[PDB]
A paper describes a structure:
Furthermore, upon release of the IpaB and IpaC effectors, IpgC binds to the AraC-like transcription factor, MxiE to promote expression of late-effector genes. Two reports describing high-resolution crystal structures of two class II chaperones have provided a great deal of insight into the structure and function of these all alpha-helical, tetratricopeptide repeat (TPR) proteins.
Here we present the crystal structure of an amino-terminally truncated variant (IpgC10-155) of the Shigella class II secretion chaperone IpgC. In contrast, iterative rounds of likelihood-based molecular replacement using a search model of residues 30-151 of a single IpgC1-151 polypeptide chain eventually provided sufficient information to identify all 18 copies of the IpgC10-155 protein present. However, the dimerization interface of IpgC10-155 observed in our crystal structure is characterized by a rotationally symmetric "head-to-head" arrangement of identical polypeptides chains. This "head-to-head" dimer buries an average of 1262.5 Å2 of surface area upon formation, which compares favorably to the 1381.9 Å2 interface previously described for IpgC1-151. Separately, a distinct region of contact that masks nearly 580 Å2 of surface area is likewise observed in the IpgC10-155 dimer. This interface arises from packing of nearly the entire extended amino terminus of one IpgC10-155 chain against primarily the α5 helix of its counterpart polypeptide. Comparison of the elution profile of IpgC10-155 to a calibration curve of globular protein standards reveals an observed molecular weight of approximately 36 kDa; given a theoretical value of 16.7 kDa per monomer, this strongly suggests that this amino-terminally truncated IpgC behaves as a dimer in solution.
Residue numbers in the entry:
A (entry chain A), B (entry chain B): 18 to 154
The structure:
């Protein structure tokens, strides 16, 4: 039988002050270089609240360091759909499409950041990438 | 719309050699004193394979240090139901019921370990607790 029992036996709901504390550790383990450990905290956060741009961006940033570019890119796709005209995710999907050796999709991602973004610093990165592509093709 | 896309986009299934590596970190963070960080790795493992005695015992051991005794005890309940006559979980449910200041339930847990367990070392702990209860009531 096993059953489950006279129980409780949750209540998986996690308090918000703890959901945030989890993010904090996810960031720390990221910064402090310990990647595979931070991939958990993120994969966890996404399992709970998947429509959070901050959590998706985190996870995607990890699949990108782990060099699993296809996955990181599909995630950035969503981070940008939840993206109220935030073009950061599109820039990185550019970096990814580049390492996936498909530079036509890559060129479009950067061209697109330049045309619609209001992040003056990001437009600079994105333009700088375009320039560096045609500089030794 | 958002959609999800041309994707994959898992595939949450985690390789077994990684599920084990996650346990390993959960233990390390536990031993190395960093509790709240280990509570995640465990809460994660239970989210995946909840019918694992090792994972449940881990999480319960953490709720018990975090002094959330009621939750720790409900988990031990299950760790023992999956428990092929392993009475360790019942011993701790005794420690918990004690801090929940309900010493009648506590006395029964220990008496029960004494009567059915084959862990000679455990039977000594369980008996010593009983003796220490009536020694200054």
């Amino acid at each position: 039988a096993i059953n489950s029992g006279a129980t409780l036996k949750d209540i998986n709901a996690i308090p918000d002050d703890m959901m945030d504390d989890i993010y904090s550790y996810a960031y720390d383990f990221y910064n402090k270089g310990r990647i595979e450990e931070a991939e958990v905290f993120f994969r966890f956060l996404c399992i709970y609240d998947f429509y959070n741009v901050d959590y998706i961006m985190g996870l995607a940033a990890i699949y990108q360091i782990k060099e699993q570019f296809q996955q990181a890119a599909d995630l950035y796709a969503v981070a940008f759909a939840l993206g109220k005209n935030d073009y950061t995710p599109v820039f990185h999907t550019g970096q990814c499409q580049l390492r996936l050796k498909a530079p036509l999709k890559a060129k479009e991602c950067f061209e697109l950041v330049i045309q619609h973004s209001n992040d003056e610093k990001l437009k600079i990165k994105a333009q700088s990438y375009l320039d560096a592509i045609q500089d030794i093709k």
